[PDB]
Design a protein around this ligand. Structure first.
Ligand code: HEC
Ligand code: HEC
Lengths: 126, 126
């Protein structure tokens, strides 16, 4: 769906921005600094689930740019493992949210965050 | 979820960018320039439905900025009508996609586009 590499870069940056917001906005809830409304969090994690599937199709071959490291494309299998592992960490978070289980939510939230960082430490130009 | 108005601006711009892509990428299909795969389009319109609900919460009071016109906030009811009408045009598109009905899809796609433009002509700083 992208005319030029720049269009793929713009798309993935936007998708990732929307993930950071839907993930990060739960931080006060996980910490207990804001109240826990199970239905609110269930709905928000559903949005996050949708968003979390979107960036990866915008790293198609030849779409070097932005703050993406070139290693994304020299080993397609390893990058795919990292996004698939991240999306399975999101599945654990979805399950916790759907169950209304705050303890599971806290644990899953931490593991999701670790998975974001794991990808960045290999594939983001700091 | 926004620390400063700038964060709401960044969010809505990103959400709107992701809408433009999920909407616009269907243009060749509606025109017959690309093939029609009902299942593909159903799945894409579902993503668009999710995205199409997201921008409006990032125009909360005091979030002037970006290319948003101030009239968004001087008549909350009229802006709300426009986003709600746009989201109901998306419902027609969803129904067409879910039915696998290309003729309905073309008609709905046109009406969705008109609804985007209707909002821009009142509320976007050209
Ligand atoms: C690899 C499998 C990643 C996972 C998992 C996550 N992110 Fe990431 N992120 C990745 C790359 C390669 C890039 C650079 C994209 C580019 O072309 O510039 C990023 C970037 C971001 C950004 C900045 C977006 C922007 O405005 O330019 C943010 C805010 C971000 N990433 C957040 C984020 C979060 C919160 C994640 C887990 C919930 C996450 N990312 C996972 C690669 C990958
Ligand atoms: C009002 C109810 C709107 C409807 C319906 C749509 N859009 Fe719009 N759009 C609107 C505003 C007020 C703004 C400015 C936001 C800001 O703070 O700058 C926009 C902006 C866009 C953009 C640019 C985003 C960016 O990168 O900065 C795009 C690509 C865009 N809008 C696309 C778009 C499409 C395709 C729509 C229908 C499918 C649509 N918008 C509807 C207000 C409203």
């Amino acid at each position: 769906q992208f005319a030029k590499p720049e269009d793929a870069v713009k798309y993935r940056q936007s998708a990732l921005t929307l993930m950071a917001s839907h993930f990060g906005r739960m931080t006060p809830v996980v910490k207990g600094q804001a109240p826990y409304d199970a239905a609110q969090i269930k709905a928000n994690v559903e949005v996050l689930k949708t968003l979390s599937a979107l960036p990866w199709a915008a790293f198609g071959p030849g779409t070097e740019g932005g703050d993406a490291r070139p290693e994304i494309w020299s080993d397609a299998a390893s990058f795919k493992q990292k996004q698939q592992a991240f999306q399975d960490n999101i599945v654990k978070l979805s399950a916790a949210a759907d169950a209304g289980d705050l303890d599971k939510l806290r644990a899953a939230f931490g593991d999701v965050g670790a998975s974001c960082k794991a990808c960045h430490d290999a594939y983001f130009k700091k």
